[model samples]
Target: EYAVEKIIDRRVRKGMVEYYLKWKGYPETENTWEPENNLDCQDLIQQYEASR
Candidate 1:
């Protein structure tokens, strides 16, 4: 399983929503962008939904 340290931020690209993910145990430079639909962290997704 993967860990999400923070939501960081997000943006739309090519008509899709992508999230800037900060992975646990990884450096900030190592953080990568991922499509929201590609992630499996329900808790984070729930929180993001509730936030909107």
Candidate 2:
């Protein structure tokens, strides 16, 4: 009933997500643009119902 998203996409992973970001010239800093990032464990059922 619980799992992790691992990363936003390919070329990123549990261990190297940050490393790969920097390698690709997309280095992240303390301040970053947050856009609806979520947790796999949280219940999203509410969102689905609210969309109606």
Candidate 3:
């Protein structure tokens, strides 16, 4: 399983939402953009939205 350390940013591309994620135990260089439908971290997503 992969853990999300934090949500750094978000963007809509081609009408889809994508989130920039910082992975737990990973370096900044390893961060990645993940589409909303592809992610399972709902609580993290909510926290990100609330922070925005």
Candidate 1 to truth, TM: 0.75
| Tens digit per residue, CA lDDT, model 1, 1-52 | 6888877777999999888889999899988889988788878767876787
Highest-TM-score candidate: 3
Best model per lDDT: 3
lDDT, model 1, position 21: 86
Error (Å) of candidate 1 at residue 23 is 0.6
Q: Name the 10 consecutive residues with the lowest summed lDDT in model 3.
A: 43-52
RMSD of each: 1.8, 12.1, 1.0
**lDDT by candidate, in order shown:** 0.84, 0.29, 0.90
State each candidate's clash count.
0, 0, 0
lDDT of 1: 0.84
Model 1 off-target regions past 4 Å?
none
Higher-scoring candidate on lDDT, 1 or 2 = 1
- lDDT of predicted model 2: 0.29
